[PDB]
Design a protein around this ligand. Structure first.
Ligand SMILES: C[C@@H](O)[C@H](N)C(=O)NS(=O)(=O)OC[C@H]1O[C@@H](n2cnc3c(N)ncnc32)[C@H](O)[C@@H]1O
Ligand SMILES: C[C@@H](O)[C@H](N)C(=O)NS(=O)(=O)OC[C@H]1O[C@@H](n2cnc3c(N)ncnc32)[C@H](O)[C@@H]1O
Lengths: 142, 147
């Protein structure tokens, strides 16, 4: 798993065309999204993560949380992102691991949002200036 | 070299604190920037690129130019980014590569922009979201530098 964390003033998206023959189904409400004062997590689920979804998710959960806590972020946004790696996990596996991360962050008490999986999305983001507002991590099954 | 291309409505940044001890010197104007209808190139210069700076730059200038054409981008922005790779090039090599790509892009006729190297920066961006507004590329040297 390749993660990119951006502490942002906001994250906003708008669903466009599908990027997969059969993307995640979504209601009208889910077509647009917006969060403010949020740590945005751009995540690429990798092929090697297929070996241990749980371990990967748990560790990913822990890292996002630590950072979310370090920068004083109460809102976290999970953003399916396929461009932080070239060894991508198949869709169904990535979606599952992404959901587990989302659930685990919700479990920790964070106000958590997510963007629909499998669609091209126009999006707006504003990274804060500070030293910890732009971090990257690599979580993989040991 | 790892490159993340974002065709966006605009890009804007503002320098904050310094990320490196000896960061690139800058003028007053280089502190803030804003460019419209631009293909933004976030680039992580890697260790393997040190093997042949000129070659890797030409290969990156080529790819970036190609994508700019596919989306009809008249504006291009070179954004120094250290998070697309875990095996980064030294500060000087990266600065030389980035400068070469920035310059190569100007020569290809594009209106080019850039954000200062080695500085934490706040930035805003707006991906257009069409099929080719989010793309990534991996560029590396094949031959060894001769000089
Ligand atoms: C390869 C292209 O022709 C194809 N349209 C494509 O984009 N596939 S993809 O791997 O980029 O994935 C498309 C979208 O499905 C979701 N997706 C698929 N695989 C992953 C993954 N491994 N990690 C995160 N998101 C993924 C994301 O929304 C991603 O943007
Ligand atoms: C030194 C750390 O505390 C700091 N977080 C850091 O990331 N430094 S760094 O070496 O990754 O690079 C900091 C900044 O210098 C520039 N930079 C340094 N190395 C590279 C590189 N290999 N490719 C692109 N930019 C780089 C970029 O502006 C990058 O954001």
């Amino acid at each position: 798993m390749r993660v990119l964390l951006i502490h942002s003033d906001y994250i906003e998206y708008e669903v466009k065309d599908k990027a997969l023959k059969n993307p995640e189904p979504i209601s009208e409400d889910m077509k647009r999204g917006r969060m403010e004062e949020v740590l945005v997590a751009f995540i690429s689920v990798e092929k090697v993560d297929e070996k241990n979804p749980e371990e990967v998710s748990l560790k990913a959960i822990e890292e996002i949380s630590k950072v979310a806590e370090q920068v004083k972020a109460e809102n976290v946004f999970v953003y399916p992102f396929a461009h932080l790696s070239s060894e991508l996990a198949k869709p169904s596996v990535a979606m599952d691991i992404l959901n587990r991360v989302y659930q685990g962050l919700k479990e920790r008490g964070f106000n958590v949002g997510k963007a629909p999986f499998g669609y091209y999305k126009a999006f707006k983001i504003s990274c804060k200036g500070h030293p910890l507002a732009e971090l990257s991590r690599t979580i993989v099954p040991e």
